[PDB]
RNA sequence: AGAUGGUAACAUAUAUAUAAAUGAACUCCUUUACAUAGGCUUUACACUCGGGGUGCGUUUUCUUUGCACUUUACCUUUAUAACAAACCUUGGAAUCAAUUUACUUGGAGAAGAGGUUCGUUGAACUCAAUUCAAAAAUUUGUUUUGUAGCAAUAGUAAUUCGUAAUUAUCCGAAGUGGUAAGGACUAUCCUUGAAAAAAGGAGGGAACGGCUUUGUGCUUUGCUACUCUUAAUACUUGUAUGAGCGUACCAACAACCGCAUCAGGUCUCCAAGGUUAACAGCCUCUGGUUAAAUAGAAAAAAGUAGGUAAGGGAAGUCGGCAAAAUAGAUCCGUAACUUCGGGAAAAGGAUUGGCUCUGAGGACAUUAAUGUUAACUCAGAACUGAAACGGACAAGGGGA
RNA sequence: GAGAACUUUGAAGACUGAAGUGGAGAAGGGUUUCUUGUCAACUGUGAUUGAACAAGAGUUAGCCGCUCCUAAGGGAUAGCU
RNA sequence: UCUGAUGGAGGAUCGAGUUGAUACUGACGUGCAAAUCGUUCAUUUCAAUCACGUUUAGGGGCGAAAGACUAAUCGAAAAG
């Protein structure tokens, strides 16, 4: 199973980068409660505009939601923005009003 | 109570009409005035 | 309200002269599946049809004398 | 294992009114409470519905007797005599 | 000055009239709103909110 | 001139709509229609657990996280499914058996096997339609669809768009037993726990086709495709659907009664979470409120409502008045006397937290053996702490 | 608003604690209901509030009830006093 | 006869609520109140509690009996 998550708008405006968003994914989902045994089974791959998330296990995509917030909370964006669904397996980041 | 009796609630009807002021044009040439809570009905 | 499930009731109870309005209702399942709703004096009768040729083929041979209420 | 020496079924009066009255009530009361043989289909069924009825569980049939048993002393003999003539 | 307003809130909104919330500044046009359809018009732009109910978690 | 299936229990009219299965007088029943107690059980509602989705919240640190929504009415004899019972067919029981928590039942016919019905419920069960193979001049097995119709078009929670419309979700499993109702039972009465309106069933068998015709409804001659039941229509019938009355609000907290906007009195239903035996007490969510014939400041005497007090412990007082003393639960132990039932929680002892463990108590399948999975309920052991643990709340003083 | 401790709004601290100042009814009340004004008196302090005062308005049923039945019982008829 | 379970009787027990009212002879006693408030106490499967309806009317009624109650009125109500 596939999900995208995806931070056009905010990278464009220069406010979040991929690399940090990457790198906080993938030593922060935790799979078996292990914080950096994702391994085999779930991995994570970088695009110059999306972050997808391949999983193999039964795994919520509320997840990403959780994680993104964190992330945007701990580097003061969080009061400037949302992460809204979009499909089935996407998540997309946006602004206020 | 809701539930009255059609010549109950046309006496009512009576009481609450009779207990209107005097019209002004006829001031210009009432004491039998009840308020529910003080002067009860009793009829 | 009276689901029916063979096609000749529906099609006798809809040239039946009591019979005033068809309800088209149409909608997504996973596919578009559709019912079709006679509106007699006493009942509303329901037929379900999951195969999209019968339910443009019943309607269209449904004569035209009695009036079409499309909800979606 | 046996639970009252000798009160039986008046153990539900407690120490309430006379050793006397309580022994006088159980000797009726478990006659009154008993089951008793019905004649009509011999099957020892027959319990009191009320103070002078006797209903049969099988029959479902019922007779009139005793107070407190199926049967009295006094109907029992005068029943005796009738049928000896 | 408020309290039909606040009634009728609470009747649309299907909630407490303990739960409402009227924008503090800006209280004209709530003033000025006499009617469930005009309470429901700004209740949808914004004027009145419903507040969230207490958290009642059941973690512990 | 009045239908038919099943051995039987009984069943059958599915027309748009199961409307019609002849039936008089006179009858005989049933429903309406009934107490209390106890547990057992089923269902719905309630509560709760976990998964999926959506939105929100926390984010110095931790948190696959905390919270909210994730809905489905009446009606369709709702069809069916399931279950407690009763009954029918077959069967023919002691080595008695079946069976309940409990006892209940049987040669007046048990168990077993196969059925019928009612009552619970109200889409359960492949329920209905549909796709694929095997049976024959129409049966059994395999898939798709649909919240069974109502029904999503409504509701809810979201994301957008001029400011009325678009879009996406509304589905995967369970546990506790609070409330309500039903069921099948057992027990109690020197207590046996309404009636009628209304409705139904039965016994009985009074009356009997149509067109035409003789004589005086009857015998008669010649011919036969005919009687009821639902719905619609047309015309006659006085105008050939649905009368009248109540419906706001309070119900006490200021709308009632107490002379009042009076700390009084005044009937009924719903009843969340935590702790717990608990609808107790204490705290909390939804809902409601922050109001009470006043406020501010100061804060002595005295009053009133409480606390605490060294040592002594009823010396106080008419009198232990008032207060204090334990008081939950588990384990142990319990006298005189006795109507043998009690006394009794007699008296009187011990233990109780937290944490980490150990043991015991069930349900579901495969060809004696191996996996999946659920309640809280007891028992025991280490460790731990200012020796404390029914830590607040709640809660006997005993004895002669 | 002339005037605000006791009118309204927002924020906070709290309370009631599903045996509730929460929702529905009965008895009783009778317009206290709603809207708009409004403050002479009343609302035992204030008061711009109000169950006060003033003007208007508001109660929609074949299916909820009464209406029907009978009960404890009441009245009346026939008589008889 | 004895033992363990099962069972669920009783004008049985504790106890909220209800229904009352033991004590403080507490407060109050120009009360919130012409009988209230607080704590304490009694009562909860039955001779139990409540509502509405209905019957009994004054030298009469009604009384598990205090001369109690019969609309703040009782060793003879209230009105004229």
Excluded at chain 3, 22 to 44: A, D, E, W
Excluded at chain 4, 26 to 44: D, N, R, S, V
Excluded at chain 4, 61 to 74: D, F
Aim: charged content about 30%; overall charge positive; hydrophobic content about 35%.
């Amino acid at each position: 199973i596939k999900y995208v998550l995806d931070c056009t708008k905010p990278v464009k405006d220069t406010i979040l980068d991929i690399s940090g968003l990457e790198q906080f994914f993938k030593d922060k989902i935790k799979v078996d409660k292990k914080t950096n045994n994702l391994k085999n089974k779930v991995v994570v791959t970088s695009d110059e505009y999306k972050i997808y998330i391949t999983v193999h296990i039964p795994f919520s995509k509320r997840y990403i939601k959780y994680l993104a917030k964190k992330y945007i909370k701990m580097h003061q964006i969080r009061d400037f923005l949302r992460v809204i669904a979009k499909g089935k397996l996407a998540y997309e980041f946006k602004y206020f009003q | 109570g809701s539930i009255k009796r059609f010549r109950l609630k046309q006496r009512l009807g009576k009481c609450r009409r009779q207990n209107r002021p005097v019209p002004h044009w006829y001031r210009l040439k009432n004491t039998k005035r009840r308020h529910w809570r003080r002067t009860k009905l009793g009829l | 309200p009276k689901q029916i499930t063979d096609i000749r009731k529906f099609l006798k109870i809809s040239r039946k002269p009591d019979t005033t309005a068809v309800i088209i209702m149409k909608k997504k399942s996973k596919t578009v599946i559709t019912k079709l709703k006679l509106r007699t004096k006493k009942y509303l009768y329901t037929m379900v049809f999951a195969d999209r040729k019968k339910a443009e083929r019943i309607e269209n041979s449904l004569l035209p004398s009695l009036k079409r209420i499309y909800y979606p | 294992s046996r639970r009252t020496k000798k009160v039986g079924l008046t153990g539900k009066y407690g120490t309430r009114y006379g050793s006397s009255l309580r022994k006088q009530i159980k000797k009726i009361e478990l006659m009154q409470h008993a089951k008793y043989l019905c004649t009509f289909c011999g099957k020892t069924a027959t319990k009191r519905t009320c103070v002078g009825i006797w209903k049969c569980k099988k029959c479902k049939r019922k007779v009139c007797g005793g107070a407190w048993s199926l049967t009295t002393p006094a109907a029992v003999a005068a029943k005796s005599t009738i049928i000896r003539l | 000055s408020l309290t039909l307003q606040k009634r009728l809130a609470a009747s649309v909104l299907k909630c407490g009239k303990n739960k409402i919330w009227m924008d503090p500044n800006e209280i004209s046009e709530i003033s000025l709103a006499n009617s469930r359809f005009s309470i429901r018009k700004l209740y949808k732009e914004g004027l009145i909110l419903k507040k969230p109910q207490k958290v009642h978690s059941r973690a512990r």
